[PDB]
Amino acid sequence: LALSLTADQMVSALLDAEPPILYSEYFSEASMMGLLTNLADRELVHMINWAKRVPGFVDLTLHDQVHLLESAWLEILMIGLVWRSMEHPGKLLFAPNLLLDRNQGKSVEGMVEIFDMLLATSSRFRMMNLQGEEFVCLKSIILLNSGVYTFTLKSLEEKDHIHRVLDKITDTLIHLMAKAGLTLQQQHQRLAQLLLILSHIRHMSNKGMEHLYSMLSDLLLEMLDAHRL
Amino acid sequence: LALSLTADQMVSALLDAEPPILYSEYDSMMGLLTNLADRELVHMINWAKRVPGFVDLTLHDQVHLLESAWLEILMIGLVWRSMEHPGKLLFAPNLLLDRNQGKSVEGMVEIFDMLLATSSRFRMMNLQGEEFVCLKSIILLNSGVYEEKDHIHRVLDKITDTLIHLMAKAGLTLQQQHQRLAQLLLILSHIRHMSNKGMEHLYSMPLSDLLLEMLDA
Ligand SMILES: O=C(c1ccc(OCCN2CCCCC2)cc1)c1c(-c2ccc(O)cc2)sc2cc(O)ccc12
Ligand SMILES: O=C(c1ccc(OCCN2CCCCC2)cc1)c1c(-c2ccc(O)cc2)sc2cc(O)ccc12
């Protein structure tokens, strides 16, 4: 199924799978982390629904689906954020009613360095004029890639399938860039520039997790392990 | 001004700049590993000066990039020379360690397993030497970037051009070329991850000044 999709059909499925932009509740420095936490927790629900619609993801065992989301969920939140913030220089659009600047990040101990890395990524996307079709491909790469090196004959089968699906998303990115008129050299170069940004998003996720710990497996299984009823 | 080399000249320069394999100074694991890494750093600086385009950056930026990249560079080198040693990491020719030795150091075995998994990934893609040296140069120029930045990106673009060249020269289709390029660059996010976890581990147990002093030999 997923391996038979054309590039156009991959783009469409990913665009359709997109989760909604959530809001914060209808503010002060003291309630800031509570609001961000509440937002991230509501976004996780929609993240599971989205991941189940990424072609190939539901072909995996539930254990492997849990592993991939457990590895990727914060990178996925962050790339969503930097995407939402791209048109808001110097600000992070956590939600439409929760647009924060650097100074508001100061107030939470540990956060401004991460806030600064997020802002620079959003500036980098803005410089590259990142398109929504490219965004959804990158977010799907993160889902399938971040946990794939921390996993039997079934496991061997699973990893091959993941890499085949990753290869299809690469084909899709290149097709988008060719459709946009880029020369072949420019296509390869832009693919590389986008994927190297994924290393920076990994970096920010690890710094973020350290920060979050200074202040999940079963929960993901519960949401992922639905009945058929 | 390194933007003028051809792909073959870029490969040849990278291959010729490769550092030597050092031995473990002995004749206490973490002390040995610490001693080795500190001696390898010197040779890493000499290597970096030969990466085309690097020296065209200010010293401040040269230092900044090395400070951000050095553990990732040590790790990918470790993974590369451990390929032919399944289940073991060849820290040095006289310092070949397996998991249970890694387990002896509280907080190491998880990253030890990640390193082992990376070397198995390299062995299973049949990573080539010309590819490896391109990947290390990318780590150097990319890890700390987030006119000077323009230049860094413009060298990074030159390395992507070179990778595609090597793959085309191997007979890969255009589709296979961009597929493998992507697989290689996604491995760099796992190398970043292992460096992040390694730094947390090492620190649970300034550098710029030391790097400056190394650039004076
Ligand atoms: O503030 C958060 C955040 C807060 C709490 C989180 O975890 C809450 C615990 N919960 C456990 C179950 C899984 C979901 C998270 C995660 C992110 C967000 C981010 C962050 C930024 C800097 C930093 O140092 C740390 C985090 S990035 C982000 C993007 C969002 O869409 C929502 C919240 C956020
Ligand atoms: O064990 C080390 C190691 C030990 C000490 C180090 O740093 C010592 C501090 N030193 C201060 C001056 C700057 C250079 C670092 C670095 C790596 C190596 C590694 C490691 C693996 C797992 C893990 O959890 C932590 C580290 S990987 C590696 C590759 C090498 O070529 C050499 C040492 C190593």
Author numbering:
A (entry chain A): 306 to 331, 337 to 461, 465 to 528, 536 to 549
B (entry chain B): 306 to 332, 341 to 459, 470 to 528, 535 to 546
Anything the authors wrote about it?
We solved x-ray crystal structures of antiestrogens in complex with Y537S and WT ERα ligand binding domain (LBD) to understand the structural basis of differential transcriptional antagonistic efficacies. RAL, BZA, and RU39411 showed the greatest efficacy of transcriptional inhibition in MCF7 cells with WT/Y537S ESR1. In addition, a new hydrogen bond is observed between S537 and E380, which was previously computationally predicted for the Y537S-BZA structure. (C) Hydrogen bond formed between E380 and S537 in Chain A of Y537S-RAL. (B) 2mFo-DFc difference map (yellow mesh) of the electron density around E380 (magenta) and H12 (cyan) of the Y537S-RAL structure contoured to 1.0 σ. BZA, RAL, and RU39411 show the greatest burial at 379.75, 377.87, and 325.21 Å respectively. Of the structures, RU39411 (SERM), RAL (SERM/SERD), and BZA (SERM/SERD) demonstrated the greatest transcriptional inhibitory efficacies in WT/Y537S ESR1 MCF7 cells. These molecules engaged a new S537-E380 hydrogen bond that enforced a well-ordered antagonistic H12 conformation that corresponded to significant surface area burial within the AF-2 cleft.
